[PDB]
Amino acid sequence: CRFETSELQASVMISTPLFTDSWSSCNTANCNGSIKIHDIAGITYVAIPAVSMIQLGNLVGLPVTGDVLFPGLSSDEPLPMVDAAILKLFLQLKIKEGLELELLGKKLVVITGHSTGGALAAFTALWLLSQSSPPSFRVFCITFGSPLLGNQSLSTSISRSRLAHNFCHVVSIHDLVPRSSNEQFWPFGTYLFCSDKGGVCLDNAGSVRLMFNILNTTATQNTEEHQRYGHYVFTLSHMFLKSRSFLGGSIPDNSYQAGVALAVEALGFSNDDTSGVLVKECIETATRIVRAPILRSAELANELASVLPARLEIQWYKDRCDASEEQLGYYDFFKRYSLKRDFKVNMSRIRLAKFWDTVIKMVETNELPFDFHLGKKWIYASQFYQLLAEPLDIANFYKNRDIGGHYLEGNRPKRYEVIDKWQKGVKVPEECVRSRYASTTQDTCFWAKLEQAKEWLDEARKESSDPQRRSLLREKIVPFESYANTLVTKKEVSLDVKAKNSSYSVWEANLKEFKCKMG
Amino acid sequence: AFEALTGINGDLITRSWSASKQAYLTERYHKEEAGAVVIFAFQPSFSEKDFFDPDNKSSFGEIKLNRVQFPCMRKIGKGDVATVNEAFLKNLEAIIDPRTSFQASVEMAVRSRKQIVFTGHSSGGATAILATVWYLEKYFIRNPNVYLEPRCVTFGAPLVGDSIFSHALGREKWSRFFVNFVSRFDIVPRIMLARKASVEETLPHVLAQLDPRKSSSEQRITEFYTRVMRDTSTVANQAVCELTGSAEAFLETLSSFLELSPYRPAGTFVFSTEKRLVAVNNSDAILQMLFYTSQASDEQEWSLIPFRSIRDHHSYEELVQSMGKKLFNHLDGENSIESTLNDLGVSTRGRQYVQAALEEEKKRVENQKKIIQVIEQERFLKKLAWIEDEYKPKCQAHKNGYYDSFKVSNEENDFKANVKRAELAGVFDEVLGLMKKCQLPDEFEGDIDWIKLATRYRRLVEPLDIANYHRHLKNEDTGPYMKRGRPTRYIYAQRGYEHYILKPNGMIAEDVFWNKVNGLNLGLQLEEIQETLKNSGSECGSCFWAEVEELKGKPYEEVEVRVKTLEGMLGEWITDGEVDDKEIFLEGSTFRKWWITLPKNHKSHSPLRDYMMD
């Protein structure tokens, strides 16, 4: 019942003006031997010339110092690397220092290039997309016959950062250059493999690599096929006048297998030859079948509803703690873990943690739509959850630890970092006049920070040094103290923080006494 | 057969064609009375100004409809109004103008229980499409009956409206009134799929060539045809990739960079070849077919197509005269479309995509059946029934009401009501999520049982969601409920119901509201009252409580207009079931406790004084 879209995605790209305009710009840049920046029909094209001299093939890590950084990509020691000649040519041509101002005020930018020009264009678009802020223009990158740019670590990092769809690499099926990089290099982004008969898109690095191997089993090697992209761009962009039916015999009745067979033919192989069978299997195993993410997202509302009673249980537990005479606040209540009410709400803590873990994995694996995390409903459901529950996960960590890192020291569950990032898909002014303490402490890591301030107050109890006690106080105690007092001042803590026997009230007392002791 | 499907017989088709021919000679329109039938045929034009309005600076000559004059031509929950060709709209407006006899003639035929037909060739067909909608908004929605049903019959018309226009025809169940004949290779139905800029240079010459007035060029025809089909290719490829939900991230990034025609087929389309007559309902399947039926199968046919594409704009005479010898069928209903599409010149790949569009409709019908089953099951309806028949009676017996009970208490029935609120949020948010992504049939938002259900849900549970918002102080995180807190599910419910109750009377909810406010004869000027009531809770009875939460903490002269507004809305809210008089005046009610604290002068003169004690 599947629907095969590799050829359709190729046809969408081919039918756009971007296809022919990016190529035109590439051709002009090649003829000039210089970068060309110009507007066609309201789109800014930055076309980087082909550079035949540089020595491709040698990997080096991304820059860690200088003016040219990629904070949006992994640091995690399967380290991303890129072609050193391309990095050097980027700094050599003064791309950053120049393009910066020549693009200010533009709103639609295509970065494009033939050959190593395309490798540099991809590097440049990656750089633009790898800053802490997104660029202030849409960025799209089309390459023609580009050699590969980096290693596997770079490619999976680009996928993980959700930048891969900003790239379309047009590869003529008889162009040796993209298929001929050394084996340490990996593709990233979507590949449009193309022939005289049409195009096929593969968006998955494994499928692209497979196709590279398949194509390397075919025949004629003349270098000048690398030089024929103008012919392919022209032929492809004019195929809309002609009616194109299946040219083999047996179009397989089944709708999915039919679209696959047509894709194989669009690459120009016959579904009878050995090569055509390999191309078929490659296209067939590119898709990886799931339930429609649009439907999955809609029905996920019922699953959020079904897990919500656990969040309500945290709400009820929190109220009951507020009403308890011990006045610990529900953070310290749950950390103490004496009562049956503590054991009961812990079940709910676990249920909610597993649900939001499952949701976030679905997001990572694309079982949910690419823009799922931008829906207001999910931003606020996850925020409401986090507000109530993150203190309990903090308390569980500190109550189970060996005394044994700190929560905020590589021990925060991933899902809370993701929820944090989702919070940026909305508005965040609207400071309202608060008439009482917030229902839940607005910094959902407040208690972790307090636990660290507690440890630091104790180690400054050890003291001896009366000017080194000051460092601990000047550097790692008073900052948290005034942070807390502004949170209390603006009423951004919940009332349980100011419960007489909460660890915050205890710490506030200890510190005020210590501060009388030494000016 | 054809008649069975369209409620239109061959005699009606032939008379429509004659009238359309007739309208060349008249200016604006020509009226043909014949038996039970009055036909209004509209004059085509063949100057560029009548396709792309010279003062329209957009790229496809498009403009949003007037929300007051076309109150159904919109998405209800989302609000977005439909879009149409501005030149065609302006032509219709000049015809509608009271200094012509058009309105009088239409009114007379309505007074005589006549069957009204609007018809036209070329852009007059487009004018017909708009005239039908005008008529459906002026007459039909006010008193729907069978004698009042229109018919609209076009021949080689260009496209007219966007997807919202088509969708709104589907919601009101007006699509059935529209039949559009298209001769296979006719270029005019395809023209408006191209960007203005793509066809600007050569369009005057080709329109002149299509005008039956002195033909005396192959380069211009071939360039024009090439450009229309290039843009049409982009439109069709993007549309089928989009409607199937394939490659969403890629498409959303590419979309920023593309200008694609919003025009979509509206109504049933009937494609005509030498041997077949093919009727198709689905707008997107038709769009794909507009592209793929005009492709060249080999070099000779390519040489021929552009010329044949101009000349086939005048094959409707032979079309209507050969109707009865052509083999008829209905693509959407056929369970193997291969033969039909082969006969229409649709390649294997074209067939994949026409099939995709039809299949997406079938998925929408499937999604709707799943939703209907969930909402008709009693495990579902019994949550609403529990809040109605257990929770509310128990809380009002407690003398505080279910709003306040949910807002402050912690008993087991309040926790139960919270659980059920969350579950109902799940069901209705799923439906909303499907509608936001166009996953349900066009009709769903107009379905009476769904409107009744969602209205019961809104009146019953929106107060609990307002209680929820304020109990956890989210109003002090993200502002008043009515601004940023209100769930979109309740807005969709409110709009569905408002449209349901107001459309037979030709009224607009916002106008109803402001006229009520003006009748309250408050002591401010118009602009001040408009400022004061911005984002207030008094536009919807199920938002009563949110308004109360905004007012209760403020001095009376800060809020006197808003207080008087709320009190003015209360009596009709109570009569219509939007607000429960057993609830809001209880001793423990937040509202009751607040109101007795309003100055003696206001309470003595309030229309609510006989409801509460100090």
Ligand SMILES: Nc1ncnc2c1ncn2[C@@H]1O[C@H](COP(=O)(O)OP(=O)(O)O)[C@@H](O)[C@H]1O[C@@H]1O[C@H](COP(=O)(O)O)[C@@H](O)[C@H]1O
């Ligand atoms: N401040 C805040 N905190 C938590 N939840 C919020 C907040 N404001 C609004 N909401 C809820 O966000 C959802 C947005 O969905 P929708 O409007 O469909 O998104 P769209 O993309 O169309 O803009 C709403 O459901 C809204 O709900 C309100 O907030 C309460 C949330 O409580 P739970 O359901 O228990 O999580 C609801 O009571 C309702 O008042």
